[PDB]
Amino acid sequence: LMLDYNLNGTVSRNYQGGDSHQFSYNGTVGGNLGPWRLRADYQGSQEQSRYKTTNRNFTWSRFYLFRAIPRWRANLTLGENNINSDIFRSWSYTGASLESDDAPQITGIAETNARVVVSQQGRVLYDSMVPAGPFSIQDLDSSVRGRLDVEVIEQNGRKKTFQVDTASVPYLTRPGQVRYKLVSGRSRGYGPVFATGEASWGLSNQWSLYGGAVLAGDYNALAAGAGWDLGVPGTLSADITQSVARIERTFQGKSWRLSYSKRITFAGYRFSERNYMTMEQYLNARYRNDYSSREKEMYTVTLNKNVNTSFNLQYSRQTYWDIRKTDYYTVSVNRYFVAVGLSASRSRDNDSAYLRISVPLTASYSGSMSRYVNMAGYTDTFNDSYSLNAGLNSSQRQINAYYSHRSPLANLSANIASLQKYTSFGVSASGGATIT
Structure with a gap:
């Protein structure tokens, strides 16, 4: 038995007289039964306010075994999970999956030493x-395919919020061989009940081609594409896919998609039809009576480019049928003569510009738009690091001190924050540890 613990807590107070305590936590509790991985x-x-409210929850999000199959070349993972697929959009489930054997970045800015949460479904x-x-x-x-829910939770009260979409890398294969997943259970x-599955054949000198299909009683979907490794200029793929969903009306529509990998620089485009429905969408319909957030024109790029500068750009637009256009875009330009970083982002719609600068x-x-903000400060580093800062927020002075320790199986950090006329204290712990 081990455990991969993550623990945050925070405590805020307030001139006008308010209290907030926060405390989250997640993890995995593992054990290894023989060949099996459990x-x-x-x-x-859970949190508490004071003016008096309190939110609080808990769960065991998943619970599943998995076992490597040396001689058959695929891993069996059986129990509760969420399907990752190189064609289909994810969803939750309890089943067994058999698949072949064989890394997204999330950017933004932080008004304050906020605490950042990333997720998908819940x-x-x-x-x-x-x-x-x-x-x-x-x-x-x-393992993370698809898009992500992000939330910045500032020490001051402004939660900010946005959306990221990982780079779905092309579903290619090496001439000789073939890749595939075969999953089947009941949505969780x-x-x-239902059973899904996708494969991809190396017909690849530089061209492979792949397909697969969802099968779920009332709902079925079908997709098929190819993909072409160009070598140094990058990668490319494209596929069509079709919905069919009867709810004892039956909705119909299809979606195309472009993939521009390169290994980095990725770009993607998805277009879906009026009543096209990714199994997740049709569940949020057929069981929550939600037919909202109709997906129409999505467009994403990821870009990190280094020449004596750094150029990380992460853009993503989703136009909807029924809900208004979605815009998230965050760029950072870093020059490393000393070092300088200028930065944009746009989380109702938001805009942050942030320019930092730094001397050994x-x-x-620094400098920060939102409410403008100017600070200077110093940071030591030793093994572990710890930095201090003074400045002005708008009139109100601002003070901030941050500590981090980065051991291989036990991290921890700590920030103290105070604005004039809120003040928060913060702690994050994470790492491995044994119980037995």
């Missing part, structure tokens, strides 16, 4: 402190 996800967060994928300023987040693993937490010895000044 894993149980748990999450949940599943928490990252949830901890980040030092006010521009940010980037890699503690997400490899609302179920009805490390010390630094």
Whole structure:
């Protein structure tokens, strides 16, 4: 038995006389039964205000085994999970899946030492402190396909919020071989039975081609595409896919999609038809009576480009049939003569511009739009690091001190924050540990 714990807590007070305590936490509690790999996800967060309210929940988000099959070349994972697929959009479920054997970045800015949470469906994928300023987040693993729910939760009260869409890399294969998943169970937490599956043949000198299909009683979907490795100029794929959903009306429509991988630079385009429905969408319809957020024209790029500068750009637009256009765009330009970073982003619609600058010895000044904000400060570093800052928010002075420790199996951080005329204290812990 081990455990991969993540723990945040925070405490805010307020001139006008208010209190807030926060405390979240998630993780995995594992054990290894012989050849079997046994894993149980748990999450949940609880908070209290004072003017007097309190939110509070808890769960075991997933609970599933998985076993590597040496000699057959695929892993069996059986129990509660959420389907990842190289063609289809995800959804929750309890089933068994058999699949072949074989990493998204999340950017933005932070008014303050907010705490950042990343997820999809309701599943928490990252949830901890980040030092006010521009940010980037890699503690997400490899398996994450599709789009992500993001929320910045500022020490001051403004929660900000946005949406990211990972780079779905082309479904290609090496000439000789072939890749595939075969999943089948009953959709989890609302179920009805179903069985899905997708493969991809190396017909690849540089061209492979792939297809698959969803099968779920009333609902069935079908898709098929090819993909072409160009070598150095990048990668490219495209596929069509069709919905069919009867609810004892039956909705119909199809979607196309472009993939521009390169290994980085990815770009993607999806277009879906009026009544086209990704199995997730048809569940949120057929069981929650939600036919909203009709997906129409999506467009995403991811770009990190290094020459004596750094050029990370992450754009994503989703135009809807029924709801108004969605715009999220966040760019960061970093020059490394000393080092300078200028940064944009747009989380009702929001806009942050942030310019930071920094001198070794490390010390630094900054600037931040929102409510404009100017600060300077110093940061030591030692193994672990710890930085201090003074400045002015608008009139009200601002003070902020941040500590981080980055051991290999036990991280931890701590921030103290105070504006004149709120003040918060913060702590994030994470790492491995044994119970037995």
